[PDB]
Amino acid sequence: MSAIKPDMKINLRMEGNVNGHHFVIDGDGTGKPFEGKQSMDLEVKEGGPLPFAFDILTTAFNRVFAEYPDHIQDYFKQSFPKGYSWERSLTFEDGGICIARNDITMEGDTFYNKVRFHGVNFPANGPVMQKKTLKWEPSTEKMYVRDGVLTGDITMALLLEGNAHYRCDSRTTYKAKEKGVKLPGYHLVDHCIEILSHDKDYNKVKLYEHAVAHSGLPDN
Amino acid sequence: HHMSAIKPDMKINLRMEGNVNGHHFVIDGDGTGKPFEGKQSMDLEVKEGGPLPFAFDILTTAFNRVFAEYPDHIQDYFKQSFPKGYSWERSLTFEDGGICIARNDITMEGDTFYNKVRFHGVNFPANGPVMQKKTLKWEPSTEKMYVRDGVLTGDITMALLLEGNAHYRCDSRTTYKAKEKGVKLPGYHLVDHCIEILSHDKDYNKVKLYEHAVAHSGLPDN
Amino acid sequence: HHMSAIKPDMKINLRMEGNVNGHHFVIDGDGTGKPFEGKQSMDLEVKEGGPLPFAFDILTTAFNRVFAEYPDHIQDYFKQSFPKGYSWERSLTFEDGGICIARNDITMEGDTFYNKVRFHGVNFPANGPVMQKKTLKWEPSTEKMYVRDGVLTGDITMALLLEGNAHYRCDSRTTYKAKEKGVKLPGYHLVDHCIEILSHDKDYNKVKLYEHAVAHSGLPDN
Amino acid sequence: MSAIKPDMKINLRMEGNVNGHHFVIDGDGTGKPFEGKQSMDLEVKEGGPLPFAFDILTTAFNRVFAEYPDHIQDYFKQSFPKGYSWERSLTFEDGGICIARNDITMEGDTFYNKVRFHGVNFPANGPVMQKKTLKWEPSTEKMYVRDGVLTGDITMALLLEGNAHYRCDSRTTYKAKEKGVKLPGYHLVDHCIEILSHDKDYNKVKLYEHAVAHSGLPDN
């Protein structure tokens, strides 16, 4: 009767505004929570074609999808059926700043995601507005508790055309809806996110992520 | 060049929608101002989301650099942006991790500015001065104005005074963009600010706000 | 207060040693100044490591807030710190990753201030404005003075003017500590600064530097 | 085609100044470069007992000692016998900022390390001046090239007494002495550093580190 099933569906609606450009994006996917793997088909419903690199949105498209070993507390699987929410800031090295929120609920075998994304101050000659990005590099999220709230800090980098990189700092706070969800100790979550396929304007994107929790060296 | 259509006495009309730490709110504003004196006041009314669960002070600079006294030797991007108007986007990075972004579309009709304002903030700690409403006021500040990536940009070291005389630092970056073509870009300059909540009811559902701003070139001709 | 053994005209003696991007240097300075006017000037000479391979400008704020005009309504922590003296520590964080720290231990014998200065910088990119010497000057600035955990702290939004009238941003954080126990701390206030190189030889082995600084309470006051 | 041996000696000399406190610390250790392991006995020679937390110094006490797999360029082992140097900034969340430098050379089977360390603006009641730190948590360094120089950024955290964490951002730049050493692609270096033993005043410290380079998920 556990709330997390081996094979679950993801329903998602994101609405947002980057540099004044409004958009709405729907997502429909599937995933294996215990293997930390998920995939989603995304469709721009409003605001297509997007004038900014689709990659800035992709980590906003659920830490339920992370394989947690036994010795690390799994805050996110413990947050269901009721669910949890997160808030995030993305601080890019050229001054562009985004904030995002996701309210996550569950019914039967399906997670529901109410997503908001806002970005300001991206320069017109920067790699985001020039759509010069190729992918997020693999990353490692550092998970710790601060003021009673599980917090994830990430040194991220977008690979650009030309083999340069473009740095972004992520800070996420995760909050279970129900009281009594046990907070975890310090730990790390490896991430790899990839756009598997897209049409020319990125009005249709298939996205994939793999995530694994561990305790660092030497144990993991 | 360009003539302004800015008048010595103008009206201000403002609607803000936003969301801080997940709480939705809508706030309306109606005020007057003296553009060439750089002074303005506004009556604010929380329409949705009252009583606000966070310190009202974090919103107040989102509540127009038209209201800044510019001397003749510094180009005035803002008065030269009308009648068509301009927009700005802003990040507020607080020292305890709280981050806000805001934007304002400013138009003009007759003697009235219209402001379409959006405000979103995340990651404010539950026991911090913002969610505990321990702020007292913004200290007077100086905005540093310069052209970055072809765009007029204002960077400000800001500080909220807290109860128990302590300060809570916030870093501000704003980009300003005229709607019309051909607006001349200024050289580097400073804008002194002082913003004040003159009065408010107990829950800050109603707030009277005041700002005074003066542009200058720094020492010694300050 | 006015019980100062600070005189209206003071000599300034300085030795800086440092290392930027692996390059060692020693620089001596001899100047004079008017503490109550907030003005000072200095002749600087590179004794070792000349000609410097980085922009001289990054060094110049390390070349004493005694030379700041304080009005009577603001507590003057720096003039009150003498005759014993005070020390400061500083970080300079540049927008392209270059970071500097600096310290100065300031003493006084007779009519002369003595300055033991150290300056270390790391992580300047090979083709950035510092290592390529594209800086023209510091822009005028305003330092924001406040108390944090018992120590007077000054935060500054600084900008180096570059070739082509672009700007290169640096964030300054300084902590100031009187040697004597019990020197009274000021409330929040603002110090305008304008630092300028008045002349130099081609390689900047010899530089004449000037600074004007004035404390104030911001608008609508000063 | 070697230069670097499976077992190598380490000689270190650090001079520095934190909060105005001058200090000199000597190091003598051994390590296995191809296994990414090293141990060092440290001894304060001037400025002891230190008035600040010893932990802030320990990552300044050589990425030679990192296990690099065959599919990733090993910039550090390729830098010898000539050597290389690094510069680092540490930015703590409460305003304390450190810079450090190390000039690494090699004479026979021994590495030599000329280390400098300077720290400023640590609050008198912060965990560093109050010596309230317990250890660095395991970390992951993100390694990428920027303006021709191999750069590593780290989200780091000190565990404190009282079940709390104290966050520090590290940026290091690494420069081979010899011209033309091949730069690597983007990659990640897991770290775990540990004070194994120490006397009461931390005037003698036994330090240990384990480091392993990898390409992130799923390649690890």
Tab-separated table of N, CA and C in Angstrom, chain A residues 3-99:
chain	number	residue	atom	x	y	z
A	3	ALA	N	2.990	4.452	-1.102
A	3	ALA	CA	2.516	5.519	-1.978
A	3	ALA	C	3.325	5.620	-3.261
A	4	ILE	N	4.602	5.249	-3.211
A	4	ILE	CA	5.472	5.270	-4.378
A	4	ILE	C	5.421	3.900	-5.051
A	5	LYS	N	5.114	3.888	-6.355
A	5	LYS	CA	5.037	2.673	-7.160
A	5	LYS	C	6.268	2.552	-8.048
A	6	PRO	N	6.584	1.346	-8.531
A	6	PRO	CA	7.785	1.202	-9.368
A	6	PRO	C	7.726	2.001	-10.662
A	7	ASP	N	6.547	2.145	-11.272
A	7	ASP	CA	6.394	2.836	-12.556
A	7	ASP	C	5.289	3.876	-12.439
A	8	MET	N	5.650	5.159	-12.497
A	8	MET	CA	4.674	6.219	-12.290
A	8	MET	C	4.687	7.211	-13.445
A	9	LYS	N	3.582	7.935	-13.563
A	9	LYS	CA	3.386	8.929	-14.601
A	9	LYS	C	3.606	10.332	-14.031
A	10	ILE	N	3.997	11.262	-14.905
A	10	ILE	CA	4.243	12.652	-14.518
A	10	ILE	C	3.397	13.550	-15.403
A	11	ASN	N	2.543	14.356	-14.787
A	11	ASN	CA	1.753	15.368	-15.473
A	11	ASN	C	2.245	16.729	-15.001
A	12	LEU	N	2.472	17.655	-15.932
A	12	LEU	CA	3.102	18.902	-15.518
A	12	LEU	C	2.585	20.068	-16.345
A	13	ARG	N	2.406	21.211	-15.679
A	13	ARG	CA	2.066	22.472	-16.325
A	13	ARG	C	2.993	23.550	-15.781
A	14	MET	N	3.783	24.161	-16.661
A	14	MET	CA	4.646	25.274	-16.297
A	14	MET	C	4.137	26.542	-16.971
A	15	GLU	N	4.121	27.642	-16.223
A	15	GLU	CA	3.861	28.962	-16.779
A	15	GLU	C	4.955	29.898	-16.304
A	16	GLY	N	5.371	30.810	-17.174
A	16	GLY	CA	6.502	31.612	-16.760
A	16	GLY	C	6.736	32.806	-17.656
A	17	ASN	N	7.803	33.520	-17.326
A	17	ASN	CA	8.141	34.761	-18.011
A	17	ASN	C	9.638	34.955	-17.870
A	18	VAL	N	10.365	34.942	-18.987
A	18	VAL	CA	11.796	35.227	-18.999
A	18	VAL	C	12.012	36.490	-19.831
A	19	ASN	N	12.666	37.498	-19.240
A	19	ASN	CA	12.996	38.760	-19.920
A	19	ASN	C	11.768	39.432	-20.529
A	20	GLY	N	10.599	39.236	-19.923
A	20	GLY	CA	9.365	39.802	-20.430
A	20	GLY	C	8.568	38.909	-21.363
A	21	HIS	N	9.092	37.747	-21.745
A	21	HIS	CA	8.422	36.855	-22.688
A	21	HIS	C	7.626	35.800	-21.917
A	22	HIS	N	6.298	35.823	-22.059
A	22	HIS	CA	5.419	34.893	-21.352
A	22	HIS	C	5.266	33.561	-22.104
A	23	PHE	N	5.104	32.465	-21.353
A	23	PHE	CA	4.968	31.168	-22.007
A	23	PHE	C	4.248	30.170	-21.105
A	24	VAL	N	3.686	29.142	-21.739
A	24	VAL	CA	3.034	28.027	-21.061
A	24	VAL	C	3.526	26.746	-21.712
A	25	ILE	N	3.948	25.785	-20.892
A	25	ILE	CA	4.531	24.540	-21.377
A	25	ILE	C	3.915	23.378	-20.607
A	26	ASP	N	3.393	22.392	-21.345
A	26	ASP	CA	2.829	21.178	-20.766
A	26	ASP	C	3.808	20.020	-20.894
A	27	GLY	N	3.766	19.134	-19.909
A	27	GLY	CA	4.652	17.985	-19.874
A	27	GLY	C	3.881	16.741	-19.496
A	28	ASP	N	4.245	15.626	-20.125
A	28	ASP	CA	3.621	14.331	-19.867
A	28	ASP	C	4.704	13.272	-19.963
A	29	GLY	N	4.975	12.578	-18.857
A	29	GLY	CA	6.093	11.661	-18.817
A	29	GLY	C	5.844	10.441	-17.957
A	30	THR	N	6.894	9.632	-17.832
A	30	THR	CA	6.892	8.417	-17.028
A	30	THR	C	8.260	8.300	-16.375
A	31	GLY	N	8.346	7.493	-15.324
A	31	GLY	CA	9.585	7.414	-14.581
A	31	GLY	C	9.567	6.249	-13.622
A	32	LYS	N	10.766	5.872	-13.176
A	32	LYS	CA	10.959	4.794	-12.209
A	32	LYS	C	11.542	5.403	-10.939
A	33	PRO	N	10.701	5.752	-9.967
A	33	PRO	CA	11.221	6.436	-8.767
A	33	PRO	C	12.373	5.715	-8.097
A	34	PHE	N	12.312	4.380	-7.964
A	34	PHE	CA	13.362	3.665	-7.247
A	34	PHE	C	14.646	3.531	-8.053
A	35	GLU	N	14.609	3.760	-9.365
A	35	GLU	CA	15.822	3.770	-10.170
A	35	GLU	C	16.321	5.179	-10.464
A	36	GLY	N	15.589	6.199	-10.026
A	36	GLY	CA	15.990	7.578	-10.245
A	36	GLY	C	16.016	7.990	-11.700
A	37	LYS	N	15.100	7.468	-12.511
A	37	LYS	CA	15.069	7.754	-13.937
A	37	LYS	C	13.680	8.221	-14.353
A	38	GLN	N	13.634	9.231	-15.222
A	38	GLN	CA	12.361	9.724	-15.723
A	38	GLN	C	12.562	10.369	-17.089
A	39	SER	N	11.490	10.376	-17.883
A	39	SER	CA	11.475	11.013	-19.194
A	39	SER	C	10.140	11.716	-19.382
A	40	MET	N	10.158	12.801	-20.160
A	40	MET	CA	8.958	13.602	-20.332
A	40	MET	C	8.928	14.206	-21.735
A	41	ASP	N	7.737	14.263	-22.325
A	41	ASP	CA	7.497	14.972	-23.576
A	41	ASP	C	6.881	16.328	-23.258
A	42	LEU	N	7.548	17.390	-23.703
A	42	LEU	CA	7.172	18.764	-23.413
A	42	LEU	C	6.656	19.436	-24.681
A	43	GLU	N	5.609	20.246	-24.538
A	43	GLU	CA	5.029	20.960	-25.671
A	43	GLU	C	4.758	22.402	-25.267
A	44	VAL	N	5.319	23.351	-26.014
A	44	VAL	CA	5.030	24.756	-25.757
A	44	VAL	C	3.613	25.044	-26.237
A	45	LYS	N	2.753	25.475	-25.317
A	45	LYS	CA	1.374	25.810	-25.646
A	45	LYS	C	1.172	27.292	-25.920
A	46	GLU	N	1.901	28.162	-25.223
A	46	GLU	CA	1.832	29.601	-25.428
A	46	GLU	C	3.245	30.155	-25.449
A	47	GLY	N	3.493	31.131	-26.326
A	47	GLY	CA	4.768	31.813	-26.349
A	47	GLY	C	5.809	31.183	-27.241
A	48	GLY	N	5.434	30.177	-28.021
A	48	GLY	CA	6.347	29.534	-28.937
A	48	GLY	C	6.377	30.376	-30.198
A	49	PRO	N	7.551	30.475	-30.841
A	49	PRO	CA	8.821	29.857	-30.442
A	49	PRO	C	9.553	30.645	-29.347
A	50	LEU	N	10.134	29.954	-28.360
A	50	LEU	CA	10.771	30.651	-27.249
A	50	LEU	C	12.038	31.369	-27.718
A	51	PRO	N	12.250	32.627	-27.305
A	51	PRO	CA	13.441	33.369	-27.743
A	51	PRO	C	14.698	33.087	-26.935
A	52	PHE	N	14.621	32.246	-25.906
A	52	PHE	CA	15.741	31.957	-25.023
A	52	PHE	C	16.059	30.462	-25.076
A	53	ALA	N	17.281	30.110	-24.673
A	53	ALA	CA	17.706	28.711	-24.684
A	53	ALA	C	16.785	27.856	-23.813
A	54	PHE	N	16.188	26.823	-24.420
A	54	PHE	CA	15.296	25.927	-23.689
A	54	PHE	C	15.974	25.337	-22.457
A	55	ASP	N	17.297	25.155	-22.516
A	55	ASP	CA	18.046	24.517	-21.437
A	55	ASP	C	17.853	25.206	-20.087
A	56	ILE	N	17.584	26.514	-20.060
A	56	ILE	CA	17.466	27.132	-18.738
A	56	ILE	C	16.247	26.617	-17.987
A	57	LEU	N	15.259	26.063	-18.686
A	57	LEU	CA	14.037	25.591	-18.053
A	57	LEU	C	14.138	24.160	-17.530
A	58	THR	N	15.156	23.399	-17.940
A	58	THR	CA	15.002	21.944	-17.896
A	58	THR	C	15.087	21.375	-16.481
A	59	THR	N	15.890	21.960	-15.576
A	59	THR	CA	15.858	21.414	-14.214
A	59	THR	C	14.567	21.740	-13.479
A	60	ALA	N	13.767	22.683	-13.981
A	60	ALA	CA	12.457	22.934	-13.400
A	60	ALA	C	11.422	21.908	-13.831
A	61	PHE	N	11.611	21.272	-14.990
A	61	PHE	CA	10.809	20.116	-15.372
A	61	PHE	C	11.240	18.881	-14.587
A	62	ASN	N	11.674	16.951	-9.783
A	62	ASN	CA	11.015	16.158	-8.752
A	62	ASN	C	12.010	15.137	-8.205
A	63	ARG	N	12.543	15.413	-7.015
A	63	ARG	CA	13.603	14.591	-6.447
A	63	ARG	C	13.100	13.242	-5.951
A	64	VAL	N	11.799	12.956	-6.075
A	64	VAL	CA	11.302	11.577	-5.974
A	64	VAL	C	12.081	10.662	-6.906
A	65	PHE	N	12.460	11.181	-8.071
A	65	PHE	CA	13.171	10.381	-9.065
A	65	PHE	C	14.671	10.471	-8.807
A	66	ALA	N	15.064	9.829	-7.720
A	66	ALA	CA	16.461	9.669	-7.374
A	66	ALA	C	16.563	8.349	-6.646
A	67	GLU	N	17.578	7.572	-6.981
A	67	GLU	CA	17.773	6.297	-6.310
A	67	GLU	C	18.520	6.563	-5.005
A	68	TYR	N	17.815	6.369	-3.858
A	68	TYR	CA	18.416	6.538	-2.540
A	68	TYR	C	18.856	5.201	-1.964
A	69	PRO	N	20.103	5.075	-1.520
A	69	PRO	CA	20.522	3.849	-0.835
A	69	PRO	C	19.954	3.820	0.577
A	70	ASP	N	20.067	2.647	1.207
A	70	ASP	CA	19.421	2.433	2.502
A	70	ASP	C	19.960	3.344	3.592
A	71	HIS	N	21.239	3.698	3.547
A	71	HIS	CA	21.820	4.456	4.650
A	71	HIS	C	21.585	5.966	4.558
A	72	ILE	N	20.836	6.449	3.572
A	72	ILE	CA	20.515	7.867	3.441
A	72	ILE	C	19.001	8.022	3.490
A	73	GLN	N	18.517	8.897	4.371
A	73	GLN	CA	17.079	9.123	4.480
A	73	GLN	C	16.529	9.718	3.191
A	74	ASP	N	15.400	9.172	2.721
A	74	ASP	CA	14.771	9.587	1.461
A	74	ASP	C	13.595	10.501	1.792
A	75	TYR	N	13.892	11.795	1.894
A	75	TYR	CA	12.895	12.784	2.276
A	75	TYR	C	11.743	12.834	1.284
A	76	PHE	N	12.041	12.651	-0.010
A	76	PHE	CA	11.044	12.894	-1.044
A	76	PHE	C	10.069	11.730	-1.164
A	77	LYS	N	10.567	10.488	-1.143
A	77	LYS	CA	9.628	9.371	-1.128
A	77	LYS	C	8.819	9.357	0.163
A	78	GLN	N	9.396	9.827	1.266
A	78	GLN	CA	8.610	9.903	2.492
A	78	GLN	C	7.563	11.016	2.475
A	79	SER	N	7.596	11.939	1.493
A	79	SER	CA	6.662	13.061	1.467
A	79	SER	C	5.335	12.726	0.806
A	80	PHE	N	5.165	11.501	0.316
A	80	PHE	CA	3.924	11.130	-0.347
A	80	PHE	C	3.123	10.158	0.506
A	81	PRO	N	1.797	10.068	0.273
A	81	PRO	CA	0.988	10.616	-0.832
A	81	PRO	C	0.744	12.133	-0.861
A	82	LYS	N	0.905	12.839	0.262
A	82	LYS	CA	0.460	14.232	0.317
A	82	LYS	C	1.286	15.131	-0.595
A	83	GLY	N	2.579	14.879	-0.700
A	83	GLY	CA	3.422	15.598	-1.632
A	83	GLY	C	4.319	16.613	-0.946
A	84	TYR	N	4.949	17.440	-1.774
A	84	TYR	CA	5.864	18.460	-1.285
A	84	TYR	C	5.992	19.536	-2.356
A	85	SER	N	6.664	20.627	-1.988
A	85	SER	CA	6.898	21.760	-2.873
A	85	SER	C	8.357	22.183	-2.770
A	86	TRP	N	8.851	22.851	-3.813
A	86	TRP	CA	10.200	23.383	-3.762
A	86	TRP	C	10.242	24.775	-4.375
A	87	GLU	N	11.265	25.519	-3.965
A	87	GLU	CA	11.592	26.835	-4.485
A	87	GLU	C	13.059	26.816	-4.857
A	88	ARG	N	13.412	27.589	-5.884
A	88	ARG	CA	14.745	27.508	-6.455
A	88	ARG	C	15.150	28.865	-6.998
A	89	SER	N	16.429	29.187	-6.846
A	89	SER	CA	17.037	30.331	-7.495
A	89	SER	C	18.172	29.812	-8.362
A	90	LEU	N	18.246	30.334	-9.593
A	90	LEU	CA	19.319	30.060	-10.547
A	90	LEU	C	20.055	31.369	-10.805
A	91	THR	N	21.327	31.425	-10.436
A	91	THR	CA	22.110	32.650	-10.543
A	91	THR	C	23.237	32.404	-11.531
A	92	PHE	N	23.086	32.970	-12.723
A	92	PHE	CA	24.016	32.779	-13.826
A	92	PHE	C	25.137	33.804	-13.771
A	93	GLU	N	26.288	33.420	-14.314
A	93	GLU	CA	27.483	34.204	-14.065
A	93	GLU	C	27.486	35.537	-14.817
A	94	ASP	N	26.627	35.721	-15.823
A	94	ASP	CA	26.567	36.997	-16.530
A	94	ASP	C	25.444	37.905	-16.023
A	95	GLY	N	24.791	37.553	-14.916
A	95	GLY	CA	23.818	38.427	-14.295
A	95	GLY	C	22.381	37.982	-14.437
A	96	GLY	N	22.081	37.093	-15.379
A	96	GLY	CA	20.732	36.568	-15.489
A	96	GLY	C	20.348	35.795	-14.231
A	97	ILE	N	19.147	36.029	-13.697
A	97	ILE	CA	18.682	35.374	-12.473
A	97	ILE	C	17.290	34.813	-12.706
A	98	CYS	N	17.085	33.539	-12.346
A	98	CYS	CA	15.764	32.936	-12.417
A	98	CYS	C	15.322	32.469	-11.036
A	99	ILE	N	14.009	32.471	-10.820
A	99	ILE	CA	13.408	31.791	-9.677
A	99	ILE	C	12.334	30.858	-10.218
